[PDB]
Design a protein around this ligand. Structure first.
Ligand SMILES: COc1ccc(CC[C@@H](OC(=O)[C@@H]2CCCCN2C(=O)[C@H](c2cc(OC)c(OC)c(OC)c2)C2CCCCC2)c2cccc(OCC(=O)O)c2)cc1OC
Length: 128
C-alpha cells in the first residue's frame, strides 16, 4: 500500500528531522522551480485518516483548491510539503499529528492524535 511505501522509503522533509512529514514523489514535475512563501498554489488532492474511515477529495469541489503558501492557510505539513513540489508533481505525504491537528484534533471529524495521508498534485503556482 501507498502509506507503507512512504513509511519505509519516504524522505523526512521536516526541519527537525522527526519523521513528522514523510514524502514520496509519485510523478516527477516539470522544470526546476518550487514555490516560495507567499506564492498562490493550485492543487488537486485526496486525503484520509490513516486510522478509521474518513476520506476527502478535491474532485468533489466545483472550483480549484487554492491557498497562499506559508501563510498558515492549511496545516503545517502542507506548508512544508507543497513547498518541496514542482509544477506537475504528484506526491504522497504521511503526516504525524504534530504537523496536522495534534492532540486537540478537529472534533468530531478529525480525532485526537490522528496521522493523515495525502496524495497531492501541484497544478500551478504564481506570485501574489
Ligand atoms: C494553520 O492551521 C490551520 C489552517 C486551516 C485549517 C482548516 C482545515 C484545512 O485543512 C487542511 O489544511 C488540510 C490540507 C488541505 C486539504 C484539507 N485538509 C484536511 O485536513 C482535510 C479537511 C479538513 C477540514 O476541516 C478540518 C475540512 O473542512 C471541513 C476539509 O474540507 C474540504 C478538509 C481532511 C479531511 C478528512 C480526511 C483527512 C483530510 C483547510 C480545509 C479546507 C480548505 C483550506 O484552505 C483552502 C481554503 O480555505 O479554500 C484549509 C486548520 C488549521 O489548523 C488545524
Amino acid at each position: 500500500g501507498a502509506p507503507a511505501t512512504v513509511t519505509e522509503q519516504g524522505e523526512d522533509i521536516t526541519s527537525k528531522k522527526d519523521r513528522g512529514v514523510l514524502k514520496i514523489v509519485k510523478r516527477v514535475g516539470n522544470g526546476e522551480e518550487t514555490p516560495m512563501i507567499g506564492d498562490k498554489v493550485y492543487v488537486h488532492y485526496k486525503g484520509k485518516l490513516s486510522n478509521g474511515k474518513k476520506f476527502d477529495s478535491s474532485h468533489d469541489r466545483n472550483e480549484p483548491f487554492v491557498f497562499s503558501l506559508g501563510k498558515g492557510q492549511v496545516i503545517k505539513a502542507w506548508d512544508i510539503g507543497v513547498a518541496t513540489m514542482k509544477k506537475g508533481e504528484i506526491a504522497h505525504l504521511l503526516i504525524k499529528p504534530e504537523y496536522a491537528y495534534g492532540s486537540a484534533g478537529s472534533l468530531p471529524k478529525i480525532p485526537s492524535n490522528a496521522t493523515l495521508f495525502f496524495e497531492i498534485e501541484l497544478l500551478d503556482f504564481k506570485g501574489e
